């Protein structure tokens, strides 16, 4: 759970997303499936999002 600090489409399929909390930031490699879930919701840089990694 964090503020979306970066959204970098890695392929032209994969996304890399950067997430930040008050206590640090993190990068995640996203499968195209979870990417399009993130993209079906209208997530943009500066949004706050909740992700469950395995579900």
């Amino acid at each position: 759970e964090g503020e979306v600090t970066e959204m970098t489409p890695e392929e032209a399929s994969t996304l890399l997303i950067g997430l930040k909390s008050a206590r640090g930031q993190k990068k995640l490699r996203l499968d195209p499936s979870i990417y399009e879930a993130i993209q079906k919701e209208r997530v943009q840089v500066g949004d706050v999002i909740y992700i469950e990694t395995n579900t």
Binding site: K20, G24, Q25
Partner: protein, 448 residues
């Protein structure tokens, strides 16, 4: 009635400002020791602080002299003789004053004032002429300014050698600095300098044009606005300097603290009050936010001379230091704030440099605070909390303070003064006569 009428009498502090103090004779004992100490291991060390020119002997642990960069010159025409002053001999009783520096700026500009200040320094050090001078510079000091100073040193005083180094970098060397991010907030400005293997990466240093001067000027602007209906004390920047020093602090969460700051509950604790001098022969004030802003929980009347002669700081306690963190919001300075500057360096610049190895991790492990304007409460904690959110989680951030924020830059130059690094960086008078005052030896603590 009761919520004010039950309160104790207000605690109020006398106003302070810079003033003359008992005479200091010229210390001939320094000249004696300087000639007794071994050859090639003695220098005069001058830190050109825009707040205080600090001068003394490299072989001593503290400056002999700490002097405002000001002069005064006037005639009491009934007495006929001219009088002339440079430093705290200017009573900051005419206060007919000029300053060596351009206002709020790190760079010397009134060279005649500077030359009178240097005359005062060499008198107080007991010069009886011939001694090496170590002198501090602004970051990226202007070539013309470097020339004009060195020209004074070599034409007017004929000194054997001069060396220029950055005061914040001397401070980073008095402490056991090796690699780190040097954050300086000074009188003139605020600089973030990345230092790698004791060498500053001045091409990657950044300056924020806010400092202890701008805080005193901004505090004055706000208090003039607070009491725009007129205030009987003569508000001056030299007073608001002491107000900023004594009463300001950095908020750990500014919006949360600010939005509740003028709630009448506990406002008597959030408020602090200073007394200017005086002499004496369903809609209510208690529901007015502007009464709280100006006069706090007590009732006010203009009959009370003392109560008319006091300013209430209140929101200015925290609004003034926040200009470093939010310059464009609070003071309209179109510059990124301190946390955004340090984050841009650590996260965007240093990992992009060739060959720098483990950026940020190398630099990130020692963010280091220098200069007097860093001395605010929670300043280090606020800077750490801000950077922590910008860094990869669990990264080994440490934010550390110099052992002294003001003298330690002089102590670093005094320790460095006669090392082989320094004497390799010295320019001799003949080298100046060859190369001219624009020339400088490239070294880790100096400008390009």
């Amino acid at each position: 009635d009761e919520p004010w009428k039950r309160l104790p009498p207000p605690t109020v502090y006398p106003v302070k400002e810079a003033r003359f103090e008992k005479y200091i004779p010229p210390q001939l004992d320094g000249r004696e020791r300087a000639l007794a100490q071994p050859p090639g291991q003695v220098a005069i060390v001058i830190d050109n602080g825009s707040h205080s020119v600090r001068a003394g002997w490299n072989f001593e642990d503290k400056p002999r002299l700490a002097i405002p960069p000001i002069m005064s010159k006037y005639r009491d025409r009934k007495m006929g003789k001219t009088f002339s002053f440079a430093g705290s001999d200017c009573y900051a009783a005419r206060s007919h004053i000029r300053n060596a520096f351009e206002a709020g700026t790190g760079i010397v500009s009134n060279w005649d004032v500077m030359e009178h200040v240097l005359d005062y320094v060499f008198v107080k050090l007991g010069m009886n002429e011939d001694m090496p001078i170590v002198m501090t510079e602004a970051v990226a000091n202007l070539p013309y300014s470097r020339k004009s100073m060195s020209e004074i040193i070599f034409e007017c005083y004929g000194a054997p050698s001069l060396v220029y180094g950055i005061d914040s970098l001397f401070s980073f060397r008095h402490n056991q600095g090796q690699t780190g991010l040097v954050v300086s907030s000074s009188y003139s400005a605020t600089h973030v300098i990345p230092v790698y293997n004791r060498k500053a990466l001045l091409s990657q240093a950044i300056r924020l044009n806010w400092g202890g001067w701008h805080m005193a000027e901004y505090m004055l602007k706000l208090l003039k606005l607070k009491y725009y209906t007129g205030f009987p004390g003569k508000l001056n920047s030299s007073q608001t300097e002491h107000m900023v020093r004594d009463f300001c602090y950095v908020s750990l969460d500014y919006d949360r603290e600010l939005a509740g700051y003028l709630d009448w509950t506990g406002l008597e604790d959030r408020e602090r009050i200073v007394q200017y001098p005086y002499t004496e022969e369903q809609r209510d004030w208690s529901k007015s936010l502007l009464h709280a802003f100006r006069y706090g929980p007590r009732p006010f009347d203009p009959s009370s001379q003392a109560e008319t002669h006091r300013v209430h700081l209140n929101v200015e306690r925290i609004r003034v230091p926040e200009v470093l963190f939010q310059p464009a919001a609070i003071a309209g300075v179109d510059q990124a704030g301190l946390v955004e500057i340090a984050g841009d360096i650590l996260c965007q610049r240093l990992p992009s440099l060739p060959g720098i190895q483990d950026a940020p991790d190398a630099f990130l492990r020692d963010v280091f605070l220098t200069g007097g304007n860093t001395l605010f409460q929670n300043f280090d904690e606020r800077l750490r909390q801000g950077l922590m959110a910008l860094l990869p989680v669990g990264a080994p951030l440490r934010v550390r303070r110099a052992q002294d924020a003001i003298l330690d830059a002089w102590r670093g130059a005094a320790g460095w003064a006669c090392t082989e690094e320094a004497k390799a960086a010295w320019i001799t008078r003949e080298e100046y006569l060859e190369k001219g005052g624009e020339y400088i030896k490239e070294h880790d603590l100096g400008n390009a």
